[PDB]
Amino acid sequence: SFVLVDRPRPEIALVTLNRPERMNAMAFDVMLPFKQMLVDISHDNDVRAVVITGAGKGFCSGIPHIGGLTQPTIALRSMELLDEVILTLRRMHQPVIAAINGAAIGGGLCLALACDVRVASQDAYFRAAGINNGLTASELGLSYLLPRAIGTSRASDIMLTGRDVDADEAERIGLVSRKVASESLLEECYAIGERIAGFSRPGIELTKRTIWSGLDAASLESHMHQEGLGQLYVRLLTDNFEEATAARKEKRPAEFRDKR
Template sequence: MTDGPEASLLVEELDEAIAVIRLNRPARLNALTREMVVELNEALAVIAVNRTVRAVILTGSGRGFCAGQDVAAADARNRTAPSGLVERYYWQEQFAGLVDRIRAMPQVVIAAVNGPCAGVGMALALAADIRLASRSARFLNAAVRLGLTAGESGMSYFLPRLIGASRAFEILITGRTVEAEEAERIGLVIRLTDDEALMDEAEALARQILVNSPFATEHTKRLVWQNVDAPSFTAAIELENRAQILASMTEDYKEATAAFIDRRPPRFQGK
């Protein structure tokens, strides 16, 4: 990954516990090239094994979050050196791997959606654990208009689970735009902010998460995502019971109960 303000991907630290990943091609509304996909996969992998980082804010530079795949770059390849089946499938897996990494990483991922959020950019936002959006945000999966399916990078998995199957089907099959106000109303994002306040809101949310036990936070993320697909209520309860007993054996649980009785803030150590 290239360093400096001209890099197509910037990774910053607000402090040792909060990382910011910023897509940085503002002139192209942060549309993803193949090179950026490689860089973003690498950045997510590095952060995932950094146990000091507990929250990640994903956002874009300029007036957009991510316009999806860089269609101009794809068109240039199609005109000059079109990819064969094996190459296309490889890159499809690299794009889809981004959402898999976001979901699997132990850190809580907050998508701070500033402006247009389309295609694989929308998939990245859906894969995040929490979504905030500016009032200028717009969500769009126009794959059906480009001769492709709307099942892109986990979109057909995440969207029905977030807003319901019927509403998700209508959005994906028409390829229409979801404006910020609708996104908040249907639960696609938790709340809207003024554009200039978005990153402050995202940081405040991250810090609200940091006051809790690291073990409890990480395993709550695991529980929620795994129980979305639980085969039964009984299976979900079994998983919850296991995680709860494990949490009750940590030093942080003992510290939390002592702090509650002593009426003081807990001092979690992640143990």
Template sequence: MAAKEVLVEKQGTVAIVTINRPDKRNAQGLKFTQNMLSAFDEVENDPDVNVVILTGAGSVFGGGGDVFEIMSTEPVDPEPEFELIRGYNKVISRIYHFDRPIIAAVNGPAVGGGVCLALACDFAIAAEQAQYFFAFARIGLTGADMGAPFLLQKHLGSARASYYILTGETIDAKEGKALGLFVDVVKQDQLQATARRLAESIAVQSRRGTTMAKLSLRRSLETHLDAALEYEAYLQSFAFQSQEHKKRLGEFIARRSS
């Protein structure tokens, strides 16, 4: 039996989604969209999961498109290629808009679309061996793939995003942290434990509160200040009425009063 290409492991209130093609450097093949969306469906339908960790099996986080499986040196019908790319884009959108926080645990190199998977998460931590680079131009493709222009500009601004996409220069873990792409860089053997500790520190918070915080953070990037403020007011007024808020507030006041 062939190994599953995307694994889901649940540890309490944390789900770990692992891209599991280490023999292919975790490259994205023909079944990537189906496998990833199925994995996130499973996580979304589990009411006990509050936080997700996305990582790769083996020594690579994500190898980008599988050049041997999805590309050809021969003339091809553009329609299937278009649908394949749209499928990959659905994965990025699903991660970016997922209703629970997602931490990327970048265990090694990420190339092209593999970088975009990490950038679509809420934040990333990296092993010392991690690196990002965009190889699109090296094989005659555009850098406009899987949200790369949008996501990288969101993190780095226009000039730096243009620089890394156009030059294909590698961003190592140390530079990635300095640029704000990684919130922390740790030794390889500490990565998963560190990711779990971070995930658990979020998972104990109010599920409704973290979901609304994520919605507000995402919306604020895509609109102007006044609209963001109005949206925040709507979310917060809704949260004020929740039973979970009243329960947690009561516990907080009791602790402060004791």
């Protein structure tokens, strides 16, 4: 009921947050089947790319094993649960593309930023709603990931005012990389997914990982070691590069076998 999965294209999974009346709020009865679904899809090798979207007008508007626990540990467990949604998205083998169909506020914004790629429809808007909710603006990666997406100036402004950021702004400042018509939003994300599906699987998987490890790295030279090894790993253990050369000489798109 609360989370839907579809296969709109043969290698592309679409995950729908489905509690439209609550704008797909990050309640636990949503976020728990959400997390498990992500784990299942990471393990499913027919899937090369994943799109996330909200049912209805919003994208996302942001407990078990609690026997014997007091309220303060329980709250710790509840936040940990949401933290794990964020880290699970980042750890998935496949790139995750956020199809931001509407409001993406508070934790919904953090959810977008936990994806690899972000696409806005004309109707998407964003807010750091933690601050409007009388708490902090910062939760679930937001104070880490927002400035790395759009820079300090724009991130501070957004986090300290709790103002609305519309689709035009979002694309202008690089909060999303694309902005499209509402009724083409998913189609655009599928088109992204399909380009990804035609690339090397380990090639793609290591690319996603080096980007995230790249945020968590503070030496160029150290990080370059990880990047190089993955390039050589795929080069030596597949015939992909010979195949891309052979395809481009025979004026043809490449078909990658990911093995010798």
